């Protein structure tokens, strides 16, 4: 089943040997996801899931080598016998070709039927375990699917797509929003399908189209500006899905190096170009263990925002959140609040819907914890500045503005009284001398002939442009406005 130009690259005995398989498979026209997944799942298993070495399995072997830092003597790596990997591969392929026969699916010249795609979906879906928790670590790979029958929400879609490549259908691809996954197929790849569940609720819309979610202007579907993958991007996804987590507090060094390396590989080949989030992931990784001759983290977060704007109508939230993070951690309040504000700038043109709970929570953390904590910390650092910069106060306001605009036209109310207390308290963190140097102008003249300035877009935030800039912050009042 495997081609010989692949076989030869085995066996793999180090992180580097793995990279070779990826650099090499990535230079073909049709990179084998099933193969790459399996290798990745296999490695990730003995490295993160079951680190104790079996001494009674003469087929499984490990490979010694000097340990990275002065700490330690020898580290062991799971040798990927061609035999083991090829056996899994075959087993997967059998399941598929043997549970679906293309005999009855006439494909007019390189297209797949909606019945065929929904079938391959079902094949994989019914192949899934009955007894497991859908949020657990290390069930993303097909290694997982084939070995344990366990696969996580995103993993299922990846699986369906790998399955199709196995059947030869080369028009089916992974669709990736920031919090979901589905499939795109047809000529020019404009036809879509739901293949996996979303969120805690096993509520699926399998066989249905995304059209309805894009329509309702929810963030799950990114107003139609979601990623449409190609084999090369899908390989990126896979590399991003590598979970180096041994424990809630422990991480596998080798799995980190491996995932960091493989991302660069993908970067040099330019395949990260349309994947903002992957650029972020690479960023964060570097911050912790930089590699020589490579760009700074900060450089990368931006390459990420660049990508967002260019290829996705700047409609993606995470590339700001990623950057906001970096500063917040690196105690750079100014730059942090800026980026959080840029975030709300995107969110404002959406609607908060049922399935958007993930992002709701991500703002709620910023609004009600992370921010009131950088501020608290700032009120103590001057007493022993930025807490006295108006532009920072505008950043905060603009942030709240976006969040108010979001709420507008939405099914569920975003704001409730609990948001208020931390608004009131964050304002109060700024001296009235400062909260007044900010020009809250609506607009002089439009168009053009031939302190800092701030214009509100939310009717809510507009109605308070005065209360925010008082010398005494009217608690009781701001509350009753913010909620309505």
């Amino acid at each position: 089943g495997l081609k010989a130009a692949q076989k030869t690259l085995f066996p793999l005995r180090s992180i580097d040997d793995v990279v070779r398989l990826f650099a090499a498979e990535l230079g073909r026209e049709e990179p084998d996801l099933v193969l790459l997944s399996l290798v990745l799942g296999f490695v990730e298993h003995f490295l993160a899931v079951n680190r104790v070495i079996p001494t009674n399995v003469p087929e499984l072997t490990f490979q010694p080598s000097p340990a990275p830092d002065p700490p330690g003597g020898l580290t062991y790596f799971p040798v990927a016998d061609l035999s083991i990997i090829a056996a899994l591969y075959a087993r997967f392929t059998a399941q598929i070709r043997g549970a679906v026969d293309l005999s009855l699916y006439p494909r007019e010249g390189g297209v797949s039927s909606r019945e065929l795609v929904k079938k391959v979906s079902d094949v994989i879906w019914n192949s899934l375990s009955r007894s497991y928790f859908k949020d657990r670590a290390h069930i993303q790979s097909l290694f997982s699917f084939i070995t344990g029958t366990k696969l996580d929400s995103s993993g299922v879609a990846f699986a369906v797509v790998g399955a199709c490549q196995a059947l030869g259908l080369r028009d089916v691809h992974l669709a990736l929003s920031e919090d979901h996954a589905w499939v795109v197929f047809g000529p020019n790849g404009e036809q879509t399908a739901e293949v996996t569940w979303h969120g805690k609720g096993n509520e699926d819309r399998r066989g249905q189209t995304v059209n309805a979610g894009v329509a309702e202007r929810s963030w799950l579907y990114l107003k139609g500006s979601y990623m449409r993958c190609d084999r090369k991007m899908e390989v990126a996804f896979m590399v991003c899905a590598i979970n180096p987590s041994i424990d809630l507090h422990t991480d596998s060094l080798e799995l980190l190096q491996l995932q960091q390396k493989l991302l660069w590989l993908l970067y040099d080949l330019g395949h990260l170009e349309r994947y903002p989030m992957a650029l972020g992931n690479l960023a964060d990784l570097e911050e912790l263990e930089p590699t020589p001759g490579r760009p700074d983290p900060l450089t990368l977060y931006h390459k990420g925002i660049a990508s967002a704007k260019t290829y996705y109508r700047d409609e993606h939230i995470y590339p700001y959140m990623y950057l906001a993070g970096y500063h917040c951690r690196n105690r750079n309040v100014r730059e942090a609040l800026q980026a959080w504000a840029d975030t709300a700038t995107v969110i404002q043109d959406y609607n908060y819907c049922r399935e958007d709970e993930e992002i709701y929570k991500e703002f709620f953390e910023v609004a009600n914890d992370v921010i009131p904590n950088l501020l608290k910390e700032a009120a103590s650092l001057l007493e022993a500045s930025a807490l006295q910069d108006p532009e920072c106060f505008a950043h905060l306001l603009r942030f709240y503005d976006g969040i108010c605009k979001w709420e507008e036209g939405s099914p569920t109310p975003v704001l409730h009284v609990g948001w208020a207390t931390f608004l009131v308290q964050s304002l109060g963190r700024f001296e009235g001398q400062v909260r007044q140097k900010v020009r809250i102008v609506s607009g002089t003249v439009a168009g053009t002939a031939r302190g800092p300035v701030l214009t509100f877009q939310s009717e809510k935030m507009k109605g308070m442009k005065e209360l925010l800039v008082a010398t005494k912050i009217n608690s009781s009042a701001i509350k009753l406005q913010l909620t309505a």
Binding site: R136, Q140, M277, E358
Partner: peptide, 8 residues
């Protein structure tokens, strides 16, 4: 344990 892949 599990994030959406590449989440921040």
């Amino acid at each position: 344990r599990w994030x959406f892949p590449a989440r921040p």
